[PDB]
Amino acid sequence: KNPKSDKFKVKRFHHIEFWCGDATNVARRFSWGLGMRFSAKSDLSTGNMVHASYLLTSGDLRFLFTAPYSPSLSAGEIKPTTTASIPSFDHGSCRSFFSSHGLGVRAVAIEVEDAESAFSISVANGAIPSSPPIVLNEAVTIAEVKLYGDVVLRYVSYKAEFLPGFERVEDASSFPLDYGIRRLDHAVGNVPELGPALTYVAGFTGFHQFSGLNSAVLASNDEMVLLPINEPVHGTKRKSQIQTYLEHNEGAGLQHLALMSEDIFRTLREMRKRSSIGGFDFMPSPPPTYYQNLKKRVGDVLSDDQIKECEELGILVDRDDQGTLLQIFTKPLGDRPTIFIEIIQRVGCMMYQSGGCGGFGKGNFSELFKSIEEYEK
């Protein structure tokens, strides 16, 4: 059941913004680890005396990395005279965010028809305003409301180059890396209480509902913008990783970004080659009993060779009644056991491919436990 109850026209995920202590080093690490090209900048060389912002792209995926300069560089500015390209930026907020949470996602940005209308409608329906609509160069409008913790939902709308004041990067500095990642599939938050978080976000967006945790997924009308939320389950045998997240993050925040690949085999080969030379690490692989059990449930979708390829790369597989799901999880992206990345590829639900085809892998909780006990015995 899709009631299509979006209170304003939502298009697609637009970008994810990380708040950093040093944007350069995080952006360079992520570029190499994920195969994303440097495509835009806003920093001292572009006249921005407030923050350094570097944009990485892979297909439609846009990762933005932002860090504050010394406030002294901009102490003579006021908001009407700012050189910041992102007018919602605030030195104090950014330093407080980073000091509190470590490296993590500040903004989940979605493109909308009219960011001013989205902001106004959201706040009229209970959204806590974070930054009011601001029109950039009479061309782009940006607005921000609180999503959970210190994460904001950022609305961006274009009249007709990422944002005004950003410059396209000199191609000598722009190496065309590409490991196959193409778009953001879903962005997941961790909260202490799932119920109130769902009520709040679904309340102001009109988005509809799509061990150790309970979760639920909020979705836009065409189910292309997917915002799941997790809460911990207490009293479990193993401590809930959601609670560990909340402790190490100092509260609610973004837990994982799921990045769609057009060729998850290639993506994982390229990422795994780079794990120990500056890239990202992956979670421990499931025992081979897991891949022994793959034939019984996805053998009509993947060949034995394609299953063997999942086994050599550590890929997990799930399927609902509509499509099949390939996925894998990285180790945490930074010092704290908080944010990590999922790589995903979906097969089926062609009409283009509908949103959330195959689900989100919830069956892999029971399948992993099964395979673990099976390999043990």
Ligand X SMILES: CS(=O)(=O)c1cc(C(F)(F)F)ccc1[C@H](O)[C@@H](C=N)[C@H](O)C1CC1
Which residues are bridge partners to 134 per DSSP? 142
Q: Could you give the strand order of the β-sheet that contains 208-209, starting from the edge strand earlier in sequence?
A: 208-209, 213-219, 226-232, 181-190, 253-261, 340-348, 323-329, 316-319
Q: Which is nearer to ligand X, 188 or 260 (CB)?
A: 188
Q: How far is the CB of 42 from Co ion (least distance, A)?
A: 30
Could you say which of ligand X, Co ion, a copy of itself, none residue 52 binds, taking C-beta under 5 to 8 angstroms by partner kind? a copy of itself
Residue 230 Cβ, how far from ligand X at the closest point, in Å?
6
* Cβ-based nearer residue to ligand X, 84 or 226: 226
Least distance in angstroms from the C-beta of 28 to a copy of itself:
5
Q: If DSSP codes are grouped into helix, strand and coil, which group holds residue 45?
A: helix
**CA atoms lying within 13 Å on the CB side of residue 143:** 23
Which among a copy of itself, ligand X, Co ion, none contacts residue 215 (Cβ within 5 to 8 A by kind)? Answer: ligand X
CA dist., res. 67 & res. 110, Å (int): 21
Q: Using CB under 5 A as the criterion, what x/- string covers residues 91-130 for binding Co ion? A: ----------------------------------------
| Residue 210: both structure tokens together | 């799509």
CB-facing half-sphere around the CA of 9: CA atoms within 13 A: 5
Nearer of residues 49 and 298 to ligand X, judged by Cβ: 298
When binding is defined by CB under 8 A, the residue of 10, 16, 23, 226 that contacts a copy of itself is: 23
> Which 257-276 positions form the footprint of Co ion (CB under 5 A)?
258
Contacting a copy of itself within 331-360 (CB under 8 A):
333-337
Q: Helices in the chain by DSSP H: which ranges?
A: 23-34, 91-101, 115-124, 194-205, 241-249, 264-273, 288-292, 295-298, 304-313, 363-376
Q: Which does 34 bind (CB under 5 to 8 A by kind): a copy of itself, Co ion, ligand X, none?
A: none
256 labelled as ligand-binding? yes
- Contact between 329 and a copy of itself by CB under 8 A: the answer reads no
What residues between 270 and 309 interact with a copy of itself by CB under 8 A?
276-279, 281
Contacts of 314 (CB under 8 A, 6+ apart): 268, 282, 283, 284, 285, 286, 328
Q: Is 14 annotated in some ligand binding site?
A: no
User: Which one of 6, 17, 144, 342 is in contact with Co ion (CB under 5 A)?
Assistant: 342
Binding site for ligand X (CB under 6 A): 186, 188, 215, 217, 228, 230, 256, 316, 329, 342, 360-362, 364-365, 368
DSSP assignment of 206-272 equals --EE---EEEEEEE-TTS-SEEEEEEE--S-SSPPHHHHHHHHHTS-EEEEEEEEES-HHHHHHHHH
Closest approach of a copy of itself to the CB of residue 202, in Å = 30
- How close are the terminal C-alpha atoms of the chain, in Å? 42
- Point out which residues bind Co ion (CB under 5 A): 258, 342, 360
Binding site feature residues for Fe cation: 186, 256, 342
